[PDB]
Symmetry: C6
Subunit: 112 residues, 6 copies
Amino acid sequence: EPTYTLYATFDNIGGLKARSPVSIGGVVVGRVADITLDPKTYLPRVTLEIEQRYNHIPDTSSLSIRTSGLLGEQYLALNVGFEDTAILKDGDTIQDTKSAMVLEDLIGQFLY
Amino acid sequence: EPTYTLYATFDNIGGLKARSPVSIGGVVVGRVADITLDPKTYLPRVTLEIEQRYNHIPDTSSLSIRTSGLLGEQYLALNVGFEDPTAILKDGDTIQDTKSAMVLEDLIGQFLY
Amino acid sequence: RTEPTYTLYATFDNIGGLKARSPVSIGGVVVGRVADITLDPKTYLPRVTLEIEQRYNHIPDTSSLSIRTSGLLGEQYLALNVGFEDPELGTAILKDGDTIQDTKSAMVLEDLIGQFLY
Amino acid sequence: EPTYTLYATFDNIGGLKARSPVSIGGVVVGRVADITLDPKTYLPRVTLEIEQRYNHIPDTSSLSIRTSGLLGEQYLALNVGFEDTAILKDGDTIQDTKSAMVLEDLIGQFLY
Amino acid sequence: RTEPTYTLYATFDNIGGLKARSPVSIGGVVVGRVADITLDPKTYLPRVTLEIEQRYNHIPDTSSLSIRTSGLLGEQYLALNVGFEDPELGTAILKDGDTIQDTKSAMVLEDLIGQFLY
Amino acid sequence: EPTYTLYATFDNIGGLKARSPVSIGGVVVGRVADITLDPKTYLPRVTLEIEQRYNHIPDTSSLSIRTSGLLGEQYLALNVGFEDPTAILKDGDTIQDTKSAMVLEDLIGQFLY
């Protein structure tokens, strides 16, 4: 499958790494190609490669970083948004992101 | 065993994959043959193969995606529904009634917020 | 050589992870083995066949089976709970080919989570 | 080390098996030698072998069945009772026992 | 060849499972490595030496370190949190040999359990 | 490193064994050399060997038995106490202040009852 490039910035990518999958409905449609840290914002930017056969994904789509079972690996959940506006293609950015949970933040929540 | 085909659409199939089992009462009656994503709806469509000897399963039946123990693998729980004046499923029929895999992050967000 | 056994049957709603050769415990002591599991072609209910060591012959009908797990990531097993022997009436002893009417099906991790939350 | 025999009856021995240790203060002083089910009571009877160098253990002592960490193995916690009456030796019984927890009873407690 | 780095130091109360070669993450992206851990012969406090890739040169003094775990049975790592750059005053940039004053020590499983209960 | 001897008595040492470490601030400063059970008190007495380079540890110091992560192994957390007009520990000294291993069954019994 040829792929098209997508970019996304998160506050915290956590356990996500190069080769991590991109799922829709839990089906893998692509892969984290590279992770790097903005020289200026010190915020991580993910580069995605999405199989071409999933070409009709809207800009209103989002990404969440998630885990696969309890001790699972980290993956990216692409949530397909409503169409009315455009469609993503090599070089487009996903605006709407949700950062990995931080186990220590949940323990501090769950206690305090 | 020869098998008969069934189809079912979920919002989220999570860890379910090709060759994942189909259980009834925890007894394996079949296998996920293929998972693919609807070209139009971007919703996963599961193709099931059920051993023929389990032919009298009604339309009011459901599937849930479940895990086998805590760190288990994902499987499909077919719940045989009550039969009443609908029909019986056979090669090519669809199961309307589905329940998508749980998402660890949604349960933690529930349990906290 | 091997301990000779007697056959017992039970029907559950859901046997979960239980399989052929799974043990049968009393007070956590193994007294036998799941011999076969099969799914009724008509009731779509699993029927378990048990082999119990002969030396445990005085088990009453009022006895139960629960499907349980051995620790958190454990294997599945059958807990046979010995019921009380009533001298009033109602209360015999199980022998080759008897059925255990009182069963409890495997717990379903998804049902516990759905309970615990909703 | 030569050993002396001790016996004990529990309602439920759970995951305890032949060769399981007998700890005092978390120090191993002996071993489950055999487990068997009373022909009449259908209650498990444990046979223990205790290293001889621990000879001054009173009758008022108890046994609890416990687990070593979360996914640990099962062991027997011998709790040394007060002396005023006697001392255990080859063939004596420990009256005071506490049966293994049953994971399904704790889940039913924790929910209902 | 290898990315050249700059040295940073930090003192914690308790470094827990953190060891030499443990990573340093920003937003979960690795920017460096624990180079050495040693215990002050006088303060009996652990002092960590860090090597940060040069290409991350614009980190402010108001930045912090927390010792964290990667999933539940994970390995220990250092979360460097980039602080705000104040144009009023008080707020420089770290260079070879600077110290990170703001630290948070490893969590102690026994302290969480003692909290959660008592 | 040459080492200096220390002794300490706990109610329950749990999973702690010979060769278990002694940490300060999570830095290993020594090893459990031997565990044995007092012939009289039936209480476990731990013999510790501490690297000599950590000689200035006060009597008001404590030991706790702890676990390294959830499924971790057991180790001894030496907490250096505040020094005030007592003394310093050296080959043969005893640590009064101890905390015995947690017992999973006691925490579950707390958490429920």
